[PDB]
Design a protein around this ligand. Structure first.
Ligand SMILES: CNc1nc2ccc(-c3c(C)ccc(C(=O)c4c(-c5ccccc5)n(C)n(-c5ccccc5)c4=O)c3N)cc2s1
Length: 260
């Protein structure tokens, strides 16, 4: 049996694993480029398989600066069926890692944080404009290109329900507004650095319930209002992504070192 993956690629390293998947870095022999390659073991559940095959077809249609870049997908059935998905390789340190390496207020300058958040919100607006939604938006699903461009995807590198909408936690029906709730918590977290995991969990739990640290509300009055709105218990009361992106806080963002 000839494996397409083993024939066409030189494996470099395992990047991680999660759910049905394992992710590798591998070099394509013909084009000489390194890619991230996710190998998904197709489940023994026909409805779960139906979803997987639908999801790959959907992702293949997507093209946006803030969405992971798609190259190829194929199936292998060695004498277990595997779905391989080949994407543009992102940096090893994701947004969660990035925030954990910037634990002081000086390392979370407002304009830098808003620049990163804007890119996330723009990726979400893109999905919503296509009648799609993310459903699992969180810092561990937000990576960077080699040039620090934000990339949103479903990475599945398991190393949480903290960013999940109340309606999803309760197993109720939902709409694209679930992504707005996630965005609210991410905006807060970008602006507010933590020194411990315990502090992070305690504070984000409070913020979910619209209880904010007083020093955040004072330093960032405009963003405080935005987060409040995005975290509305009622999905109807949360703003659309387009209205978030058009907010005055995102105008003329600049910082020393920003790409010209
Ligand atoms: C350490 N560097 C890394 N760079 C990358 C770059 C890309 C990926 C990656 C790969 C290799 C494959 C797919 C994705 C991804 O974002 C996925 C996405 C996706 C893509 C774009 C936007 C939202 C989700 N989907 C839908 N699905 C999917 C497919 C079948 C079933 C369920 C989910 C995904 O796996 C994905 N993020 C993983 C890594 S790890």
């Amino acid at each position: 049996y000839i494996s397409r993956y083993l024939t066409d690629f030189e494996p470099i390293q395992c990047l991680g694993r999660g759910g049905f998947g394992v992710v590798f870095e591998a070099k394509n022999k013909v084009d000489d480029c390194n890619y991230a390659i996710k190998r998904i073991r197709l489940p023994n559940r026909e409805l779960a398989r139906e979803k997987v095959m639908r999801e790959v077809k959907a992702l293949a249609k997507l093209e946006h600066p803030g969405i992971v870049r798609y190259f190829n997908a194929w199936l292998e059935a060695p004498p277990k069926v595997y779905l391989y998905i080949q994407m543009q390789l992102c940096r090893k340190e994701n947004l969660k890692d990035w925030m954990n390496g910037r634990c002081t207020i000086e390392e979370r300058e407002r304009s830098v944080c808003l620049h990163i958040f804007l890119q996330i919100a723009e990726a979400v607006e893109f999905l919503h404009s296509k009648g799609l939604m993310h459903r699992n938006l969180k810092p561990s699903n937000i990576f960077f290109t080699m040039d620090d461009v934000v990339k949103v995807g479903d990475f599945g590198l398991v190393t949480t329900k903290l960013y999940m909408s109340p309606e999803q936690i309760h197993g109720n029906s939902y709409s694209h507004k679930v992504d707005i709730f996630s965005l609210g918590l991410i905006l807060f977290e970008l602006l507010y650095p933590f020194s411990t995991q315990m502090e992070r969990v305690r504070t984000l739990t409070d913020v979910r319930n619209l209880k904010f640290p007083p020093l955040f509300t004072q330093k960032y009055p405009c963003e405080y209002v935005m987060v409040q709105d995005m975290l509305s218990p009622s999905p109807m009361e949360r703003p659309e992504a387009i209205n978030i992106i058009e907010n005055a806080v995102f105008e003329d963002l600049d910082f020393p070192g920003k790409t010209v």
